[PDB]
Symmetry: D2
Subunit: 329 residues, 4 copies
């Protein structure tokens, strides 16, 4: 008989019920950066990949499968049909058009809204209890779209948002100050995009307020021009796009950070995109980034940041920008 039966006595007929399954929609540059970061952080016991082109999809799956010896995720699967995503805890959406050199994320909206009308109903059919983590751009507006299409409560529809902007800001802050980004605390809120809002009043190392030490922090009168650090954050993706054509590694690591807080129910605070109506002075159904408590139920809580009136005004302008696109959909 077969070698497998010569070698192995089967004791147990098992139907596969996945316990810690994550799906990545889209095996482009971002989706595969998300995939490898999730795999190398041991967050899922099953990873499912979905996309619309079957060759690319099978190719990426096999390339990951070939490294199984080096991973601790035993089941990696893929298909064009969303049945392969069934019963995911977390579904990460990365499908969509990306920026050309110099193009605004907001110029992607018509193309990717239409894509979400195809994707989101399919996701929700097969993982009705999942958390949705939207990465595709413009991420704030597409989290809104995923919310309206899915019918999920707002705690379960999350945009990757400014987790990455805040990481970029902290890295640049640490380079100037000579400490690790981990030890530099500062928050970028609002749109993941040109209208993001640096919260100068909250920046600190070891609880020492930087704006107290350096009162011109964040103003145009500042001899050190710390405002150009936030400008570098705004410009960073256009700079990397100009240089290598796209961005991938940093967002993949940022998404895997968020995925860890969800899958392990850490209730860590992250600046991510959520439905902010009734807070921070905002009256419309806009999604933008504020500090959110993130765990196994998604966003359970929002932190109420004490913005200066000018920081509050920048945040309102960010909301108004997003609502100006949102109202046309």
């Amino acid at each position: 008989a077969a070698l497998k039966d010569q070698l192995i006595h089967n004791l147990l007929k098992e139907e596969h019920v996945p316990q810690n399954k994550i799906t990545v929609v889209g095996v482009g540059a971002v989706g595969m950066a998300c995939a490898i970061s999730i795999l190398m952080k041991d967050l899922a016991d099953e990873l499912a990949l979905v996309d619309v082109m079957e060759d690319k999809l099978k190719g990426e799956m096999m390339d990951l499968q070939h490294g199984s010896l080096f991973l601790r995720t035993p089941k990696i699967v893929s298909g064009k049909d969303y049945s392969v995503t069934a019963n995911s805890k977390l579904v990460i959406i990365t499908a969509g058009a990306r920026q050309q050199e110099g193009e605004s994320r907001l110029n992607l909206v018509q193309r990717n809204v239409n894509i979400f009308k195809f994707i989101i109903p399919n996701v929700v059919k097969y993982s009705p209890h999942c958390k949705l983590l939207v990465v595709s751009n413009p991420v704030d507006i597409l989290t809104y779209v995923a919310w309206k299409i899915s019918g999920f409560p707002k705690n379960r529809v999350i945009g990757s948002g400014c987790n990455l902007d805040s990481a970029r800001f902290r890295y640049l802050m640490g380079e100037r100050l000579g400490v690790h980004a981990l030890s530099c605390h500062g928050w970028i809120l609002g749109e993941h995009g040109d209208s993001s809002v640096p919260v100068w009043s909250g920046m600190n190392v070891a609880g020492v307020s930087l704006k107290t030490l350096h009162p011109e922090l964040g103003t145009d009168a500042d001899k050190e021009q710390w405002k150009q650090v936030h400008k570098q954050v705004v410009d960073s993706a256009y700079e990397v796009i100009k240089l290598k054509g796209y961005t991938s590694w940093a967002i993949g690591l940022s998404v895997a950070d968020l995925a860890e807080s969800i899958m392990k129910n850490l209730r860590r605070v992250h600046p991510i995109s959520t439905m902010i109506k009734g807070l921070y002075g905002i009256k419309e159904d806009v999604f933008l980034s504020v500090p959110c408590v993130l765990g196994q139920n998604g966003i359970s809580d929002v932190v109420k940041v004490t913005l200066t009136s000018e920081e509050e005004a920048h945040l309102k302008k960010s909301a108004d920008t997003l609502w100006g696109i949102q109202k046309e959909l």
Copy 2:
């Protein structure tokens, strides 16, 4: 200045990296190696080198933007190999995708060796066995410090495929692909086992044409795998990145694990020429310190001699 208002410096520090790694070539393979090494915390400094200077700065910046999520505090890049100085390990992934990559290595290797005279050289560029030889000749390093990624990946693929057929994890499926990376590689059917159970003793037709289960086709699938993935997505990157990081881990942590990697094998296995082939090698902080002597069948042994002769035939035609 905010820095001085906030921080009182108590010590003048010279940057002397203690666990530095360099990756040469930031293509699909090099960046897969880079992200794997970063996510395994194997270096305190990562250096990147390429000739495409825009691509190089963009890749470096993209990794840097993820520092908050990593525990590698310094990531640097440049076309000038001064950025690679004092690396413990230098990984070569540059090149087309033989004579084209020899000509490249003629510029790369002397630059690497100038700035990190004591490093281990890990060659991934293809054809990996021939270019490890080239790197060895050009560097002047002793053979323990020149390593080809070789059949480490081939063996991982083999173990994945064996596991999917047997219903167990690749980790629990043991099997060795030796010799040349790619077409002429050698599946050592006699060593294949789960839990120390010899699959060839259990299933005597293992590895033969008369095998009703066609296990020989699993080797063909390993041989063919890079071509099938290239046909489907255009190149391979993730599996090789992870296997290079596995090697890097054994080197950086002095683990003395056994891997099937490409080493200068003259004087062993009946081989009489200066060729690099994969055999099981003990890998640690001095590179390859010891070679395991596998008991090969008479024509497993003949097949491995054929690879030697094949590789030697190409090496004789090299200009450098």
Copy 3:
């Protein structure tokens, strides 16, 4: 109230990857710290009868929360804290005095299991039960009979540790890491364990092929003394520090990892072997088992020499002799 000034609550907790440890002694806490540092659980629950020591171990772990990724640690003498565990690890009971056989602990620990196990089942009726308490093979059988669980879900830590010890000693003799030295110790976790000399190999190279007298009394290199060292290891360490903890901690966390991540790795662990290897009784002992999210789904059929086979049926005989009395 500061919390409400700081935090707008949006949303009114079922743990998804919970692990319980019963017995927060030397072994239990080694298992706990090892599982915590491997990020295998989203909730860890601890149970003991000594309520003060229980609360103190819990608090000491909790104080390290900043450095961990397991956000909830709970404890109590009441087993309600353990509800909805995927995995429950039994490390409670009497341990060996210097020179004492593990089999001598059986009467005391059967008694203890009679209260423990029904309370575990009560709160986590679908968990996998990983028994560590000694004698581990007989107590896995006991846990199975008391719990009513199917055999796939009652696991004894068994010879995972013996084989790890064996591979460390082999690697030290061969100059390579334990990971690259392969070798299986089967049967009783104790004096009657069985080294499978025919499977010991590096890179698929059988040592017995180079050295057919390996492991036998005719071996000038005395490789049989390596197995003796494995047999004696627990006794030597008890004599030296009074107990063993760290290695079994790590071995249990290895097993936990295969279970919690559904790895289907093969481990030498204690299972109901009736009708394999020629055995006709309800004995538990270690053979190579495929370990995943449903526990033990498959057993590898190892081909033993006649002597290895005889030694395993003697190990089997030595057990059961005790089981039948209970």
Copy 4:
């Protein structure tokens, strides 16, 4: 030939990331297991005066080698096993109160450090020295004076665990993970430590701005009792289980990670603070310190109230007072 030579052809005839733990008690072995499970070392050495216990602990760890990525674990009462360590962690000594000030009791652990520290220096002269034994601020000073090391290479664990406990307690009250709560306990380890109310925050939101009574007796939420609770937590755990081990071991492994990976994270740890914060004596107090491969290279200058400043100055004076009476 021998089996090994039949199997393996030797082709080729100094550890790079070695760590030593001195004292294999409750604290020392928690440090060891945490450091092993974080893959920070290529070699781990253990030293104690109890030779049986030492061999037993070493063997127990070795038996777990298969499950680790640290390939060499060594032990001995002779310090030759510690040679070439990057980091040496001192956990040896009598168990004593965090703030212990009584001279007879202090001097007992000073005497132990007189035997340990020169032997540590003998074999790892370039190491960083990490002192955990109590009283930690005084014994870090003693280790510095006996070792002859520059101050950047002598580190007291100080208030590093205190601040982690404080962040745990903050998170339990606020419903977030300790990682997302920020707060700093500084100064002299023990009853005299200084909770810096001004820096406590979540997401950069100052709790003291939202709750101006934070840290006063009139505060109806009694946040000042959270500091008392930190200061008393070790004693409460001792009362319950007889000693403490797991949290300190984790916090020491976190420091070691910063050192071994050259991370330059900021930790509240005890450093030779003369010349800063108005302090004029050779004392060790916890301040936010940048910790990397060369130890403590930089300190954050925290803006303190006049009273917080006075507290630190008085800690300096009383530590210096004790130190003057020590014999070594």
